[PDB]
PDB file of all heavy atoms in Angstrom:
ATOM      1  N   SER F   1      -2.920  11.597  -0.047  1.00  0.00           N
ATOM      2  CA  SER F   1      -4.287  11.479  -0.543  1.00  0.00           C
ATOM      3  C   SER F   1      -5.199  10.870   0.517  1.00  0.00           C
ATOM      4  O   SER F   1      -4.815  10.745   1.680  1.00  0.00           O
ATOM      5  CB  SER F   1      -4.329  10.629  -1.815  1.00  0.00           C
ATOM      6  OG  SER F   1      -4.060   9.271  -1.525  1.00  0.00           O
ATOM      7  N   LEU F   2      -6.407  10.489   0.107  1.00  0.00           N
ATOM      8  CA  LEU F   2      -7.359   9.841   1.009  1.00  0.00           C
ATOM      9  C   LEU F   2      -6.918   8.424   1.372  1.00  0.00           C
ATOM     10  O   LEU F   2      -7.361   7.867   2.374  1.00  0.00           O
ATOM     11  CB  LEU F   2      -8.762   9.813   0.389  1.00  0.00           C
ATOM     12  CG  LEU F   2      -9.490  11.159   0.360  1.00  0.00           C
ATOM     13  CD1 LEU F   2     -10.865  11.026  -0.241  1.00  0.00           C
ATOM     14  CD2 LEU F   2      -9.601  11.710   1.766  1.00  0.00           C
ATOM     15  N   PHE F   3      -6.037   7.850   0.561  1.00  0.00           N
ATOM     16  CA  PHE F   3      -5.564   6.494   0.806  1.00  0.00           C
ATOM     17  C   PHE F   3      -4.585   6.424   1.978  1.00  0.00           C
ATOM     18  O   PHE F   3      -4.719   5.567   2.854  1.00  0.00           O
ATOM     19  CB  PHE F   3      -4.921   5.919  -0.458  1.00  0.00           C
ATOM     20  CG  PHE F   3      -5.886   5.743  -1.596  1.00  0.00           C
ATOM     21  CD1 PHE F   3      -5.811   6.546  -2.722  1.00  0.00           C
ATOM     22  CD2 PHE F   3      -6.863   4.763  -1.544  1.00  0.00           C
ATOM     23  CE1 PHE F   3      -6.701   6.380  -3.772  1.00  0.00           C
ATOM     24  CE2 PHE F   3      -7.755   4.594  -2.587  1.00  0.00           C
ATOM     25  CZ  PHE F   3      -7.673   5.403  -3.703  1.00  0.00           C
ATOM     26  N   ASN F  16     -11.833   1.000  11.130  1.00  0.00           N
ATOM     27  CA  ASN F  16     -12.082   1.398   9.755  1.00  0.00           C
ATOM     28  C   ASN F  16     -12.283   2.881   9.674  1.00  0.00           C
ATOM     29  O   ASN F  16     -13.188   3.376  10.258  1.00  0.00           O
ATOM     30  CB  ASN F  16     -13.317   0.681   9.226  1.00  0.00           C
ATOM     31  CG  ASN F  16     -13.686   1.064   7.802  1.00  0.00           C
ATOM     32  OD1 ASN F  16     -13.407   2.127   7.333  1.00  0.00           O
ATOM     33  ND2 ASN F  16     -14.332   0.180   7.134  1.00  0.00           N
ATOM     34  N   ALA F  18     -13.035   4.977   7.034  1.00  0.00           N
ATOM     35  CA  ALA F  18     -14.134   5.499   6.235  1.00  0.00           C
ATOM     36  C   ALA F  18     -15.454   5.375   6.987  1.00  0.00           C
ATOM     37  O   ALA F  18     -16.309   6.257   6.909  1.00  0.00           O
ATOM     38  CB  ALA F  18     -14.209   4.780   4.906  1.00  0.00           C
ATOM     39  N   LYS F  19     -15.623   4.293   7.708  1.00  0.00           N
ATOM     40  CA  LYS F  19     -16.826   4.023   8.458  1.00  0.00           C
ATOM     41  C   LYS F  19     -16.977   4.796   9.755  1.00  0.00           C
ATOM     42  O   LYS F  19     -18.064   5.111  10.148  1.00  0.00           O
ATOM     43  CB  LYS F  19     -16.917   2.536   8.734  1.00  0.00           C
ATOM     44  CG  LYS F  19     -17.916   2.107   9.780  1.00  0.00           C
ATOM     45  CD  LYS F  19     -17.714   0.656  10.108  1.00  0.00           C
ATOM     46  CE  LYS F  19     -18.616   0.205  11.220  1.00  0.00           C
ATOM     47  NZ  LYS F  19     -18.066  -0.937  11.983  1.00  0.00           N
ATOM     48  N   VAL F  30     -15.879  13.963   4.641  1.00  0.00           N
ATOM     49  CA  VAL F  30     -16.402  14.771   3.543  1.00  0.00           C
ATOM     50  C   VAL F  30     -16.750  16.197   3.971  1.00  0.00           C
ATOM     51  O   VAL F  30     -17.040  16.449   5.138  1.00  0.00           O
ATOM     52  CB  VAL F  30     -17.649  14.117   2.921  1.00  0.00           C
ATOM     53  CG1 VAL F  30     -17.239  12.934   2.066  1.00  0.00           C
ATOM     54  CG2 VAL F  30     -18.610  13.666   4.001  1.00  0.00           C
ATOM     55  N   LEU F  31     -16.674  17.120   3.045  1.00  0.00           N
ATOM     56  CA  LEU F  31     -17.071  18.474   3.288  1.00  0.00           C
ATOM     57  C   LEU F  31     -16.038  19.310   4.023  1.00  0.00           C
ATOM     58  O   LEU F  31     -14.886  18.963   4.049  1.00  0.00           O
ATOM     59  CB  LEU F  31     -18.423  18.492   3.962  1.00  0.00           C
ATOM     60  CG  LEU F  31     -19.492  17.882   3.064  1.00  0.00           C
ATOM     61  CD1 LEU F  31     -20.860  18.052   3.630  1.00  0.00           C
ATOM     62  CD2 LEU F  31     -19.464  18.503   1.700  1.00  0.00           C
ATOM     63  N   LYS F  60      -6.673  15.534  -1.001  1.00  0.00           N
ATOM     64  CA  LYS F  60      -7.522  14.395  -1.221  1.00  0.00           C
ATOM     65  C   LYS F  60      -6.970  13.458  -2.231  1.00  0.00           C
ATOM     66  O   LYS F  60      -7.140  12.294  -2.127  1.00  0.00           O
ATOM     67  CB  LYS F  60      -8.903  14.844  -1.631  1.00  0.00           C
ATOM     68  CG  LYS F  60      -9.679  15.371  -0.470  1.00  0.00           C
ATOM     69  CD  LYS F  60     -11.036  15.870  -0.873  1.00  0.00           C
ATOM     70  CE  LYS F  60     -10.943  16.797  -2.061  1.00  0.00           C
ATOM     71  NZ  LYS F  60     -12.214  17.512  -2.259  1.00  0.00           N
ATOM     72  N   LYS F  61      -6.314  14.011  -3.227  1.00  0.00           N
ATOM     73  CA  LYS F  61      -5.876  13.237  -4.365  1.00  0.00           C
ATOM     74  C   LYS F  61      -4.385  13.010  -4.505  1.00  0.00           C
ATOM     75  O   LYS F  61      -3.990  11.960  -4.929  1.00  0.00           O
ATOM     76  CB  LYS F  61      -6.464  13.787  -5.647  1.00  0.00           C
ATOM     77  CG  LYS F  61      -7.864  13.345  -5.860  1.00  0.00           C
ATOM     78  CD  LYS F  61      -8.588  14.276  -6.773  1.00  0.00           C
ATOM     79  CE  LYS F  61      -9.363  13.509  -7.806  1.00  0.00           C
ATOM     80  NZ  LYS F  61     -10.398  14.381  -8.395  1.00  0.00           N
ATOM     81  N   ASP F  62      -3.569  13.969  -4.131  1.00  0.00           N
ATOM     82  CA  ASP F  62      -2.140  13.801  -4.235  1.00  0.00           C
ATOM     83  C   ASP F  62      -1.589  12.767  -3.286  1.00  0.00           C
ATOM     84  O   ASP F  62      -1.722  12.896  -2.110  1.00  0.00           O
ATOM     85  CB  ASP F  62      -1.444  15.130  -4.036  1.00  0.00           C
ATOM     86  CG  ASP F  62      -1.712  16.107  -5.143  1.00  0.00           C
ATOM     87  OD1 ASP F  62      -2.010  15.709  -6.261  1.00  0.00           O
ATOM     88  OD2 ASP F  62      -1.605  17.292  -4.899  1.00  0.00           O
ATOM     89  N   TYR F 109     -22.609   9.066  11.540  1.00  0.00           N
ATOM     90  CA  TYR F 109     -23.141   9.490  10.250  1.00  0.00           C
ATOM     91  C   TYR F 109     -23.911  10.792  10.400  1.00  0.00           C
ATOM     92  O   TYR F 109     -25.112  10.857  10.152  1.00  0.00           O
ATOM     93  CB  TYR F 109     -24.026   8.403   9.658  1.00  0.00           C
ATOM     94  CG  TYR F 109     -23.445   7.017   9.788  1.00  0.00           C
ATOM     95  CD1 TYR F 109     -23.886   6.149  10.776  1.00  0.00           C
ATOM     96  CD2 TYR F 109     -22.461   6.573   8.917  1.00  0.00           C
ATOM     97  CE1 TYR F 109     -23.364   4.873  10.894  1.00  0.00           C
ATOM     98  CE2 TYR F 109     -21.929   5.300   9.026  1.00  0.00           C
ATOM     99  CZ  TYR F 109     -22.384   4.454  10.015  1.00  0.00           C
ATOM    100  OH  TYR F 109     -21.854   3.188  10.124  1.00  0.00           O
ATOM    101  N   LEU F 111     -25.433  14.517  10.122  1.00  0.00           N
ATOM    102  CA  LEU F 111     -25.932  15.368   9.093  1.00  0.00           C
ATOM    103  C   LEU F 111     -25.305  16.692   9.178  1.00  0.00           C
ATOM    104  O   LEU F 111     -25.731  17.503   9.902  1.00  0.00           O
ATOM    105  CB  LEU F 111     -27.434  15.532   9.188  1.00  0.00           C
ATOM    106  CG  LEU F 111     -28.106  14.199   9.100  1.00  0.00           C
ATOM    107  CD1 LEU F 111     -29.556  14.338   9.454  1.00  0.00           C
ATOM    108  CD2 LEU F 111     -27.880  13.623   7.729  1.00  0.00           C
ATOM    109  N   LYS F 112     -24.309  16.899   8.359  1.00  0.00           N
ATOM    110  CA  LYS F 112     -23.507  18.085   8.362  1.00  0.00           C
ATOM    111  C   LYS F 112     -24.121  19.371   7.877  1.00  0.00           C
ATOM    112  O   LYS F 112     -23.738  20.376   8.351  1.00  0.00           O
ATOM    113  CB  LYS F 112     -22.215  17.815   7.642  1.00  0.00           C
ATOM    114  CG  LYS F 112     -21.631  16.496   8.023  1.00  0.00           C
ATOM    115  CD  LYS F 112     -20.287  16.288   7.392  1.00  0.00           C
ATOM    116  CE  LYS F 112     -19.497  15.239   8.110  1.00  0.00           C
ATOM    117  NZ  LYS F 112     -18.301  15.807   8.740  1.00  0.00           N
ATOM    118  N   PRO F 113     -25.067  19.369   6.956  1.00  0.00           N
ATOM    119  CA  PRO F 113     -25.653  20.671   6.604  1.00  0.00           C
ATOM    120  C   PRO F 113     -26.288  21.428   7.779  1.00  0.00           C
ATOM    121  O   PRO F 113     -26.378  22.655   7.732  1.00  0.00           O
ATOM    122  CB  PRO F 113     -26.718  20.299   5.568  1.00  0.00           C
ATOM    123  CG  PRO F 113     -26.177  19.084   4.913  1.00  0.00           C
ATOM    124  CD  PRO F 113     -25.518  18.314   6.028  1.00  0.00           C
ATOM    125  N   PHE F 114     -26.699  20.715   8.821  1.00  0.00           N
ATOM    126  CA  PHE F 114     -27.331  21.354   9.972  1.00  0.00           C
ATOM    127  C   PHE F 114     -26.314  21.748  11.040  1.00  0.00           C
ATOM    128  O   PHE F 114     -26.681  22.123  12.156  1.00  0.00           O
ATOM    129  CB  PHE F 114     -28.397  20.433  10.563  1.00  0.00           C
ATOM    130  CG  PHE F 114     -29.479  20.070   9.587  1.00  0.00           C
ATOM    131  CD1 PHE F 114     -29.408  18.892   8.860  1.00  0.00           C
ATOM    132  CD2 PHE F 114     -30.554  20.918   9.381  1.00  0.00           C
ATOM    133  CE1 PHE F 114     -30.397  18.562   7.953  1.00  0.00           C
ATOM    134  CE2 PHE F 114     -31.545  20.596   8.479  1.00  0.00           C
ATOM    135  CZ  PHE F 114     -31.467  19.416   7.758  1.00  0.00           C
ATOM    136  N   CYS F 115     -25.035  21.646  10.696  1.00  0.00           N
ATOM    137  CA  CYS F 115     -23.971  22.090  11.582  1.00  0.00           C
ATOM    138  C   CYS F 115     -23.884  23.610  11.615  1.00  0.00           C
ATOM    139  O   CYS F 115     -24.099  24.276  10.602  1.00  0.00           O
ATOM    140  CB  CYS F 115     -22.626  21.504  11.146  1.00  0.00           C
ATOM    141  SG  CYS F 115     -22.455  19.732  11.431  1.00  0.00           S
TER     142      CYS F 115
ATOM    143  N   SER H   1     -36.177  17.775   3.304  1.00  0.00           N
ATOM    144  CA  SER H   1     -34.807  17.876   3.797  1.00  0.00           C
ATOM    145  C   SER H   1     -34.179  16.497   3.870  1.00  0.00           C
ATOM    146  O   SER H   1     -34.741  15.522   3.368  1.00  0.00           O
ATOM    147  CB  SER H   1     -34.767  18.532   5.177  1.00  0.00           C
ATOM    148  OG  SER H   1     -35.306  17.664   6.159  1.00  0.00           O
ATOM    149  N   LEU H   2     -33.022  16.416   4.519  1.00  0.00           N
ATOM    150  CA  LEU H   2     -32.338  15.142   4.687  1.00  0.00           C
ATOM    151  C   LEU H   2     -33.087  14.236   5.658  1.00  0.00           C
ATOM    152  O   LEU H   2     -32.901  13.021   5.650  1.00  0.00           O
ATOM    153  CB  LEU H   2     -30.901  15.360   5.167  1.00  0.00           C
ATOM    154  CG  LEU H   2     -29.939  15.939   4.124  1.00  0.00           C
ATOM    155  CD1 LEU H   2     -28.542  16.070   4.691  1.00  0.00           C
ATOM    156  CD2 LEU H   2     -29.925  15.085   2.868  1.00  0.00           C
ATOM    157  N   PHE H   3     -33.942  14.823   6.487  1.00  0.00           N
ATOM    158  CA  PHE H   3     -34.698  14.047   7.462  1.00  0.00           C
ATOM    159  C   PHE H   3     -35.814  13.245   6.803  1.00  0.00           C
ATOM    160  O   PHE H   3     -35.973  12.056   7.078  1.00  0.00           O
ATOM    161  CB  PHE H   3     -35.268  14.956   8.549  1.00  0.00           C
ATOM    162  CG  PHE H   3     -34.215  15.612   9.400  1.00  0.00           C
ATOM    163  CD1 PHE H   3     -33.966  16.970   9.299  1.00  0.00           C
ATOM    164  CD2 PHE H   3     -33.476  14.868  10.301  1.00  0.00           C
ATOM    165  CE1 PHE H   3     -33.003  17.568  10.079  1.00  0.00           C
ATOM    166  CE2 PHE H   3     -32.510  15.462  11.082  1.00  0.00           C
ATOM    167  CZ  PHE H   3     -32.274  16.813  10.972  1.00  0.00           C
ATOM    168  N   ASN H  16     -30.703   1.309   7.654  1.00  0.00           N
ATOM    169  CA  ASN H  16     -30.198   2.596   8.130  1.00  0.00           C
ATOM    170  C   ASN H  16     -29.782   3.422   6.921  1.00  0.00           C
ATOM    171  O   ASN H  16     -28.848   3.057   6.208  1.00  0.00           O
ATOM    172  CB  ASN H  16     -29.018   2.386   9.097  1.00  0.00           C
ATOM    173  CG  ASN H  16     -28.484   3.687   9.697  1.00  0.00           C
ATOM    174  OD1 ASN H  16     -28.564   4.757   9.094  1.00  0.00           O
ATOM    175  ND2 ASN H  16     -27.938   3.590  10.903  1.00  0.00           N
ATOM    176  N   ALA H  18     -28.305   6.522   6.595  1.00  0.00           N
ATOM    177  CA  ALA H  18     -27.063   7.224   6.603  1.00  0.00           C
ATOM    178  C   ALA H  18     -25.962   6.252   6.418  1.00  0.00           C
ATOM    179  O   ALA H  18     -24.999   6.561   5.800  1.00  0.00           O
ATOM    180  CB  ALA H  18     -26.880   7.977   7.899  1.00  0.00           C
ATOM    181  N   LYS H  19     -26.130   5.064   6.946  1.00  0.00           N
ATOM    182  CA  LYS H  19     -25.090   4.083   6.940  1.00  0.00           C
ATOM    183  C   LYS H  19     -24.979   3.387   5.612  1.00  0.00           C
ATOM    184  O   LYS H  19     -23.919   3.050   5.187  1.00  0.00           O
ATOM    185  CB  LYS H  19     -25.355   3.071   8.030  1.00  0.00           C
ATOM    186  CG  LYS H  19     -24.321   1.994   8.161  1.00  0.00           C
ATOM    187  CD  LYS H  19     -24.697   1.066   9.278  1.00  0.00           C
ATOM    188  CE  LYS H  19     -24.119  -0.321   9.088  1.00  0.00           C
ATOM    189  NZ  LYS H  19     -24.977  -1.378   9.673  1.00  0.00           N
ATOM    190  N   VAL H  30     -23.643  12.589   0.235  1.00  0.00           N
ATOM    191  CA  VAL H  30     -22.864  13.817   0.118  1.00  0.00           C
ATOM    192  C   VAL H  30     -22.315  14.042  -1.289  1.00  0.00           C
ATOM    193  O   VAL H  30     -22.167  13.097  -2.061  1.00  0.00           O
ATOM    194  CB  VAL H  30     -21.689  13.822   1.112  1.00  0.00           C
ATOM    195  CG1 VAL H  30     -22.193  14.120   2.507  1.00  0.00           C
ATOM    196  CG2 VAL H  30     -20.960  12.490   1.081  1.00  0.00           C
ATOM    197  N   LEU H  31     -22.118  15.297  -1.629  1.00  0.00           N
ATOM    198  CA  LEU H  31     -21.507  15.685  -2.875  1.00  0.00           C
ATOM    199  C   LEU H  31     -22.381  15.597  -4.116  1.00  0.00           C
ATOM    200  O   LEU H  31     -23.575  15.530  -4.042  1.00  0.00           O
ATOM    201  CB  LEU H  31     -20.217  14.911  -3.084  1.00  0.00           C
ATOM    202  CG  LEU H  31     -19.273  15.059  -1.920  1.00  0.00           C
ATOM    203  CD1 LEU H  31     -18.069  14.179  -2.037  1.00  0.00           C
ATOM    204  CD2 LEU H  31     -18.833  16.483  -1.765  1.00  0.00           C
ATOM    205  N   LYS H  60     -31.689  19.729   0.767  1.00  0.00           N
ATOM    206  CA  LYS H  60     -30.996  19.268   1.924  1.00  0.00           C
ATOM    207  C   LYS H  60     -31.583  19.771   3.197  1.00  0.00           C
ATOM    208  O   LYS H  60     -31.526  19.097   4.179  1.00  0.00           O
ATOM    209  CB  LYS H  60     -29.532  19.637   1.838  1.00  0.00           C
ATOM    210  CG  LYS H  60     -28.831  18.924   0.717  1.00  0.00           C
ATOM    211  CD  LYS H  60     -27.343  19.128   0.751  1.00  0.00           C
ATOM    212  CE  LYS H  60     -26.975  20.537   0.371  1.00  0.00           C
ATOM    213  NZ  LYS H  60     -25.639  20.589  -0.262  1.00  0.00           N
ATOM    214  N   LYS H  61     -32.151  20.961   3.185  1.00  0.00           N
ATOM    215  CA  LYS H  61     -32.614  21.555   4.426  1.00  0.00           C
ATOM    216  C   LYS H  61     -34.079  21.812   4.550  1.00  0.00           C
ATOM    217  O   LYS H  61     -34.613  21.705   5.594  1.00  0.00           O
ATOM    218  CB  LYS H  61     -31.815  22.789   4.751  1.00  0.00           C
ATOM    219  CG  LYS H  61     -30.395  22.461   5.025  1.00  0.00           C
ATOM    220  CD  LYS H  61     -29.523  23.669   4.850  1.00  0.00           C
ATOM    221  CE  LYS H  61     -28.626  23.822   6.039  1.00  0.00           C
ATOM    222  NZ  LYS H  61     -29.375  23.593   7.283  1.00  0.00           N
ATOM    223  N   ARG H  63     -37.781  21.325   4.911  1.00  0.00           N
ATOM    224  CA  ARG H  63     -38.692  20.262   5.321  1.00  0.00           C
ATOM    225  C   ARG H  63     -39.951  20.285   4.462  1.00  0.00           C
ATOM    226  O   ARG H  63     -40.274  21.297   3.837  1.00  0.00           O
ATOM    227  CB  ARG H  63     -39.083  20.404   6.797  1.00  0.00           C
ATOM    228  CG  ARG H  63     -37.944  20.728   7.761  1.00  0.00           C
ATOM    229  CD  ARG H  63     -37.016  19.548   7.982  1.00  0.00           C
ATOM    230  NE  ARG H  63     -37.722  18.364   8.459  1.00  0.00           N
ATOM    231  CZ  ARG H  63     -37.827  18.017   9.737  1.00  0.00           C
ATOM    232  NH1 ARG H  63     -37.270  18.763  10.680  1.00  0.00           N
ATOM    233  NH2 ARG H  63     -38.487  16.918  10.076  1.00  0.00           N
ATOM    234  N   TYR H 109     -18.858   3.023   1.788  1.00  0.00           N
ATOM    235  CA  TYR H 109     -18.120   4.223   2.153  1.00  0.00           C
ATOM    236  C   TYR H 109     -17.147   4.560   1.027  1.00  0.00           C
ATOM    237  O   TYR H 109     -15.931   4.575   1.211  1.00  0.00           O
ATOM    238  CB  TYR H 109     -17.381   4.029   3.480  1.00  0.00           C
ATOM    239  CG  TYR H 109     -18.207   3.334   4.542  1.00  0.00           C
ATOM    240  CD1 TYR H 109     -18.010   1.991   4.831  1.00  0.00           C
ATOM    241  CD2 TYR H 109     -19.175   4.024   5.263  1.00  0.00           C
ATOM    242  CE1 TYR H 109     -18.758   1.348   5.801  1.00  0.00           C
ATOM    243  CE2 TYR H 109     -19.934   3.387   6.232  1.00  0.00           C
ATOM    244  CZ  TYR H 109     -19.720   2.051   6.499  1.00  0.00           C
ATOM    245  OH  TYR H 109     -20.467   1.416   7.469  1.00  0.00           O
ATOM    246  N   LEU H 111     -14.926   6.257  -1.857  1.00  0.00           N
ATOM    247  CA  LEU H 111     -14.112   7.462  -1.960  1.00  0.00           C
ATOM    248  C   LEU H 111     -14.459   8.228  -3.223  1.00  0.00           C
ATOM    249  O   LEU H 111     -13.903   7.968  -4.286  1.00  0.00           O
ATOM    250  CB  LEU H 111     -12.626   7.108  -1.947  1.00  0.00           C
ATOM    251  CG  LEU H 111     -12.133   6.401  -0.685  1.00  0.00           C
ATOM    252  CD1 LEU H 111     -10.707   5.917  -0.868  1.00  0.00           C
ATOM    253  CD2 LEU H 111     -12.232   7.323   0.526  1.00  0.00           C
ATOM    254  N   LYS H 112     -15.362   9.194  -3.089  1.00  0.00           N
ATOM    255  CA  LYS H 112     -15.936   9.899  -4.236  1.00  0.00           C
ATOM    256  C   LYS H 112     -15.001  10.835  -5.025  1.00  0.00           C
ATOM    257  O   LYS H 112     -15.227  11.030  -6.223  1.00  0.00           O
ATOM    258  CB  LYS H 112     -17.156  10.701  -3.775  1.00  0.00           C
ATOM    259  CG  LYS H 112     -18.204   9.849  -3.080  1.00  0.00           C
ATOM    260  CD  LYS H 112     -19.330  10.684  -2.489  1.00  0.00           C
ATOM    261  CE  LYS H 112     -20.419   9.784  -1.904  1.00  0.00           C
ATOM    262  NZ  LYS H 112     -21.405   9.365  -2.945  1.00  0.00           N
ATOM    263  N   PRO H 113     -13.958  11.417  -4.383  1.00  0.00           N
ATOM    264  CA  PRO H 113     -13.076  12.251  -5.210  1.00  0.00           C
ATOM    265  C   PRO H 113     -12.424  11.515  -6.380  1.00  0.00           C
ATOM    266  O   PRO H 113     -12.077  12.165  -7.363  1.00  0.00           O
ATOM    267  CB  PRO H 113     -12.007  12.723  -4.214  1.00  0.00           C
ATOM    268  CG  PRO H 113     -12.712  12.771  -2.926  1.00  0.00           C
ATOM    269  CD  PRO H 113     -13.639  11.574  -2.950  1.00  0.00           C
ATOM    270  N   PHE H 114     -12.266  10.198  -6.292  1.00  0.00           N
ATOM    271  CA  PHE H 114     -11.656   9.449  -7.388  1.00  0.00           C
ATOM    272  C   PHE H 114     -12.678   8.904  -8.388  1.00  0.00           C
ATOM    273  O   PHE H 114     -12.322   8.140  -9.283  1.00  0.00           O
ATOM    274  CB  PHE H 114     -10.807   8.304  -6.839  1.00  0.00           C
ATOM    275  CG  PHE H 114      -9.708   8.763  -5.932  1.00  0.00           C
ATOM    276  CD1 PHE H 114      -9.878   8.760  -4.558  1.00  0.00           C
ATOM    277  CD2 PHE H 114      -8.507   9.211  -6.454  1.00  0.00           C
ATOM    278  CE1 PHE H 114      -8.868   9.197  -3.724  1.00  0.00           C
ATOM    279  CE2 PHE H 114      -7.496   9.650  -5.627  1.00  0.00           C
ATOM    280  CZ  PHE H 114      -7.675   9.643  -4.259  1.00  0.00           C
ATOM    281  N   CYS H 115     -13.939   9.307  -8.251  1.00  0.00           N
ATOM    282  CA  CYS H 115     -14.955   8.904  -9.216  1.00  0.00           C
ATOM    283  C   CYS H 115     -14.765   9.645 -10.526  1.00  0.00           C
ATOM    284  O   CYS H 115     -14.378  10.815 -10.537  1.00  0.00           O
ATOM    285  CB  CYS H 115     -16.367   9.159  -8.680  1.00  0.00           C
ATOM    286  SG  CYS H 115     -16.911   8.055  -7.360  1.00  0.00           S
TER     287      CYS H 115
END
Side-chain angles (χ1 to χ4, degrees):
Chain F
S1 70
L2 287 181
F3 295 110
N16 178 333
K19 166 190 176 207
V30 285
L31 297 188
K60 285 178 311 193
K61 280 157 134 161
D62 293 335
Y109 316 101
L111 302 169
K112 317 185 160 245
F114 301 95
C115 289
Chain H
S1 70
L2 288 182
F3 295 109
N16 183 331
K19 181 180 154 211
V30 284
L31 305 173
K60 294 188 289 209
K61 295 159 131 316
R63 316 288 304 264
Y109 317 102
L111 299 172
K112 304 173 175 274
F114 301 96
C115 288

